[PDB]
Amino acid sequence: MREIVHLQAGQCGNQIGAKFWEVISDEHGIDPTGTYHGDSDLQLERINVYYNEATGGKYVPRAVLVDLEPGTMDSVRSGPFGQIFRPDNFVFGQSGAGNNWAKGHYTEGAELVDSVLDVVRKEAESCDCLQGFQLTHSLGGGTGSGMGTLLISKIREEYPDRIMNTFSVVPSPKVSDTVVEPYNATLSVHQLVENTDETYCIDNEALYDICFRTLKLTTPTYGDLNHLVSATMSGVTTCLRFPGQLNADLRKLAVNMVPFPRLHFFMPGFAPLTSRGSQQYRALTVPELTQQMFDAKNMMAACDPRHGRYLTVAAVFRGRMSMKEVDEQMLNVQNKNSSYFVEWIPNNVKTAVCDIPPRGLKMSATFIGNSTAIQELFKRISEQFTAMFRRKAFLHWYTGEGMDEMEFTEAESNMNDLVSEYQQYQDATA
Amino acid sequence: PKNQSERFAFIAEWYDPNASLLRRYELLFYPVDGSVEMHDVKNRRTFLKRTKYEDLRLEDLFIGNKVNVFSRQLVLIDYGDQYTARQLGSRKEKTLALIKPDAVSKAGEIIEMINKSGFTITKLRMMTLTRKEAADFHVDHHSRPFYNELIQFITSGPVIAMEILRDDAICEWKRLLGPANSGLSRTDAPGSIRALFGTDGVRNAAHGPDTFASAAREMELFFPSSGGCGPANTAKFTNCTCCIIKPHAISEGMLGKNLIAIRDACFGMSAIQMFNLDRANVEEFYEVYKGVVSEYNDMVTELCSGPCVAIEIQQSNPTKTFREFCGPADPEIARHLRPETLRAIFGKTKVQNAVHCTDLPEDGLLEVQYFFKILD
Amino acid sequence: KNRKYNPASFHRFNLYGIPTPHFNDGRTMAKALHWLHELQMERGAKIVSK
Amino acid sequence: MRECISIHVGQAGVQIGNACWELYCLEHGIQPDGQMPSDKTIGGGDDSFNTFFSETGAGKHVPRAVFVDLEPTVVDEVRTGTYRQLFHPEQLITGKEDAANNYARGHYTIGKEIVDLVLDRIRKLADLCTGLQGFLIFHSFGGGTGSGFASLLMERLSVDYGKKSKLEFAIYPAPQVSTAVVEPYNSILTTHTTLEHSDCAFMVDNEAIYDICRRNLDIERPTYTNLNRLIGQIVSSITASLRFDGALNVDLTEFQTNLVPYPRIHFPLATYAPVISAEKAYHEQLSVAEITNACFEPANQMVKCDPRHGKYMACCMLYRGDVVPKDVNAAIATIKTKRTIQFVDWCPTGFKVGINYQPPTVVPGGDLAKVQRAVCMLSNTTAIAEAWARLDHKFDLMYAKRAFVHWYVGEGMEEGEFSEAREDLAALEKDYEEVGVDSV
Amino acid sequence: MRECISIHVGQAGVQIGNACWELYCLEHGIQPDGQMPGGDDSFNTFFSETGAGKHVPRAVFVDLEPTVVDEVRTGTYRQLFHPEQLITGKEDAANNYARGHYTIGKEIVDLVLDRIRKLADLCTGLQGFLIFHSFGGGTGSGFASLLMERLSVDYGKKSKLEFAIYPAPQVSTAVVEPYNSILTTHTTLEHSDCAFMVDNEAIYDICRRNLDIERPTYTNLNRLIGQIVSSITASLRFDGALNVDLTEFQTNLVPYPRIHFPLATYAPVISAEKAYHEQLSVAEITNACFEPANQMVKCDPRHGKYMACCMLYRGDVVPKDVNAAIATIKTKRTIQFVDWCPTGFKVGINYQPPTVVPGGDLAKVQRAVCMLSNTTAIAEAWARLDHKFDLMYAKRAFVHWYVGEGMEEGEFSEAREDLAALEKDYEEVGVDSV
Ligand SMILES: Nc1nc2c(ncn2[C@@H]2O[C@H](COP(=O)(O)OP(=O)(O)OP(=O)(O)O)[C@@H](O)[C@H]2O)c(=O)[nH]1
Ligand SMILES: Nc1nc2c(ncn2[C@@H]2O[C@H](COP(=O)(O)OP(=O)(O)OP(=O)(O)O)[C@@H](O)[C@H]2O)c(=O)[nH]1
Ligand SMILES: Nc1nc2c(ncn2[C@@H]2O[C@H](COP(=O)(O)OP(=O)(O)O)[C@@H](O)[C@H]2O)c(=O)[nH]1
Ligand SMILES: [Mg+2]
């Protein structure tokens, strides 16, 4: 019916994907061993979206972890829920791409793609009807940012009708850890805009601020980013695995999030982020929820929405409420904030409500929106990409791998093509 | 970390029910930070990272223990190396602690005195030894005088049987006993078991093992490693309810204190034995509690997390409702309204109530039977 | 040089730096996402005025 | 699985290998015999030792290092040393007669005798290893063996394994102090070798080490052992990501692609922090921002140069120990918010961050205190041009009189190659000038 | 949080730092090792905690002759301070501002600037640089002058409090000192927010007349200097009813940019024998604050008019008795205020009483007070100094040392003109518009 496979590429995708399979498995009460150890019946009804039944009641994740370096597998195999995975889903090579997009996309990737494609073919056939595909990768690496786009490129040709979604991690100029990071990004975004139904841009730096200010953790680690995205990752799919007062799924959003096929980039949000001190003075209500979604100290992207007008807004709410105010505050936030929403689309907001709360919490919500703020994140990329390219800097590996100079000129044209018509969609009259 | 300092290791065993094969693993512990590791043996991989496991402590590192590591009930079967044997377990030893039938009422005080002296109880059961089993104990006394008197006293009451593990346990457990003649013991020092409650040399409280060779003989007589339990349980399945002293209360050394608070309440203690049941037996017992309470698996986890003691509470006194003596399930509401309940005197977090007791009156015999007929 | 510091305080093997206890995996923010009111009710029931 | 082979050449290479393999055996827990401690043969699921050692039938682990020299003494002291049984007696390769500071001697006459033996031994070690990552070649530009034999060995190694990565650690003649006077000739002549047949070079001068250990370590009278411990610490910081696990694992290919802008520019500068004795770390609290500043102090560089006179093209950070990515981002933001540190117009992002869990160890009887956090810095900057400028000056003042040329000629080397190598080095300098040119 | 760095220069600076830091560790409870056995992080203004819990001060002793700093290295607090806080130069200026400002200082300028850089990087939100020197010593003049010149552009806004020993009008332990004192004044004019000119002679008179000590030493005066700086900084160090930061008293003590020269006073300075039978109260100590025989600068404020007053009580003091005292002080014809300040007073309240070092001179007294008086009665000492400098300079004696060092000769005349203009400005302030 509605089944999702969880592709997993690169070191950034692996840790996020691994910590994700942690998060849901408590929501379904599945042990490290892998048997059913929940309480309620609803906690075990729709595991078939992410889990495949095995003999004796064992449940296995539906995921394929891919990396050019086998060390990240060893980092994944041996964690808390490390061994739950399929012993043959790990497909890996002996040399890494070294953050080099071309080596992952062309040189070394061409040999590992076939072994990955058979495994996903087996898992695609294993379930009767697939709703979509799911894959996490950073845009500043070489394995996930590289071969992963090749994996998406092939798989659309195989399965065109299904949903392809990715949680791409976008590099931030303020804190950057790769000298060739924009080069990999500008080569990757062109792969994305051609082939993806939806995309969420996640920036580490926005999580760095959220950890520092909203939650006020003294020493956050890289588990903070992974856990916060994983909870967001589970929120967008709760209305699938679980019944709600108002139902939705990925395609329900997908039809309603994408006004034109080129615009599929979104900013994620999660409402109940409060520091341990702040818990003492807070009566759990929905008015402060919508307050906590819409203040943009909550965005996980690095683009302020006050600069860019909101096109389409969606907020999926998790927990048992009534809705007369979630329609009122819907209407309330739209009317008085007139200037920040597009005019040719009134009733800019779309909602989903799922009756089942998260573990450890009463109310929860996940916010996704399409806005003109994201155009600031692309035109900043051209600001450093052009700096390296005008001097042909750091070129000799990509040139030495066998491709030409044209591929960079085409990517920037399409990158500039996107923002120019995006700028047009900012400046249009109703 | 730095892969340095104390890094002791044991040999783990896990019964994988799906594969239906016993698998042996490399168990690793780092006492400096309390962290845990585990690696595959045959596949030459790493089973489990260096993550801390506060649920696993240095007190749990010994052979024949059922620890719970990431929901894997692990039995440690062998010292993983030489250097773990030299530091952790060179001189810790296991010795029998029988309590003769005179002092069975004083058990809850003596078990407290056992816990204060650092001993750790591993096997626990009350027994009724036959005459032939009694003669097997006193084989060393067959030539020696008063053989019949020594036999006649010992098979005249429900003998208590314990096994205590500690460093230098054989010497300390004999030292805690004091002189065998109870009259001599009071003159020597009242701070012994045979002096506080003992009356005469024949009716001293305990007659623990003396040497290693003597110890190994008697330990198999009571607690057979072969599984052929010799002395039958003293469990009269009549007008009774069962009480489980939960593992969290065991580790904090309240085992004797809970036993004291039952005996003075004029409740008959017909039967008491320790069972280190696994999760599957926990699910069968708590099968009725599945679904009604919103924390079934948390309630499941605590019983199999450590050692628990099941007690058959005989129904007596003009007021017999042991159900109310335990009191409200949450200790906090117990503390707020009815502090005289055990779940307020020995209260803790909501799950960590002092004991578990039967709720429906009909389920008393069934839960007694499941714990003292099939599991026994 | 031998500065001849206090014998019972200075040495070479003692670690001299600021301990910042930070834990890489999901525990801290897992308990942070665990709202405390659910933690208090899992601890037990609470009581207010008539 | 990652393995990297050490190819130490000359006395510098041999002593560096002594210090480095001592550090590695201490890091992994191997006694001088070459075993596990028997009573605590814990080991387990981690074969982090695999990148430097290899098992045998007897449960013993041999380093993947070849020490090659043309004079017996330097290796004979190892064969009589405490690590005599650590190494295989055929791994230690010696010549009857050395080159004696003569490039033509170590490159055309004496080296060719043992070329085949060295090639066979590296072939055997590569056969033992399964997935090879690279060669670590250690030498100096001064000594005749350490220049000529390294040159020819790498010349044949390139055609043997064109694609395997080749990291080159070498000791530059210092600007003022020197142990040789014929050395600039050899240093000029090996420029072609280190330019055409390498992927990354890590030139170090002794005099900066002198300055640093007398500045911070308070050793008024240090020695080559004190240099070698520091250099081995650099190598350990580079290879610890391969050895153990980390939050942001970075391999040799990763730092390669993030240090080298152009095929002719593969000369980054190494930097370590904190290099401090225990007395000084007592009162200073060390943290990530301040150690990062220590990485960018020009008086803490291994090279006698001022990077403020030039512009950075790339920087690689290797943080190790108890480190947090949040203070990492705070430190990099603080560094970027400065004007003294310049960056070229074509690297507004100019860093490659690696993060590692375990802190470095220290050896007993060393100079470095044990601290919870450390950092290595690899800066590809254009300020290194002046070192080869002074080298060209010095070479030219020799070459106007053809001093010491008769030795090379009698050895049998055609004289024009001196001028040819000068033209190549001059072209390299002009390429660095083009790098420094910014299109504003 | 709040923090001040101490930058003692010269022998006077290093000895003042010795006394002040002894008093600080005894005040907070620091053992000589540096380890702790109102306010919680009250040490955080002067200490940067290690990972072990030890506490390191925030000071850099700077000197151009190691013999002194060397006694500190051989002192008990070798376990307290850190050696690269203790910076020494090979050859001293030898009472030569020329040598201290142009020749020998430039060798160590970069090193000391880097050490202040690292300490200010340890500092998060900085409050103050407190610096100490003398107007007689060559190093304490020249090196301090160039250091302040650099610090002006390296910390534009940061408050840089300046404490200096002035040449006493009668007793002079140097003969070349008026030249250095004339020259140094340009730096304390153009590069300081507040300066604390104090001569030794008045301190000697006060400690003789009140403390009954017939034979004092530099330790005796230095303890009082440490007490003064302790009283100044205790409002920042611990909570008070009315806290007083540095910015407040700078705001409220300097009328014009050219005018930043207050006079310090502290009361009571009394031995225990004299203090048993004396009941002390706020009115008495306030009256003692204004007696001209207890002023630590050899001038009579009755010869001038006050423009500003900074009262700093400490101990068991109450705002109503403060207001009573301020009423009695304002109701007096002898004390004269300028016509353009009818309100001229700052009161700081502080909870804890001043501590007493063992082997000191001051008795443990439940209440004490400090005075920062900005009056026009201070130009007369510079008038004496200019007369001495003129009777020097009419002969061009000792000029040859500075000239052979290599400073231009007309800077002497330029500095004399600057001092003359400063005194004329103070006369303009003293003029009343009635
Ligand atoms: N860092 C460091 N450099 C060394 C050491 N030993 C020698 N060198 C350098 O090596 C250069 C000379 O080469 P050597 O390694 O001594 O000898 P070689 O490489 O065998 O060359 P030949 O002696 O001519 O055979 C000198 O200029 C030194 O700078 C050492 O222990 N540490
Ligand atoms: N009150 C007081 N004054 C001091 C002290 N030490 C030095 N002085 C004064 O400082 C002046 C001379 O300067 P010094 O401190 O001795 O040394 P300097 O300032 O570095 O100048 P040079 O001697 O040239 O190096 C003398 O006139 C003293 O009055 C002290 O401990 N207490
Ligand atoms: N959110 C998140 N990001 C990560 C994690 N680990 C690494 N990253 C990011 O991934 C980037 C490095 O990607 P890389 O490993 O080169 O990607 P690959 O080439 O596909 O393997 C870094 O800039 C990190 O910010 C993680 O656990 N969580
Ligand atoms: Mg040699």
Ligand SMILES: [Mg+2]
């Ligand atoms: Mg002096």
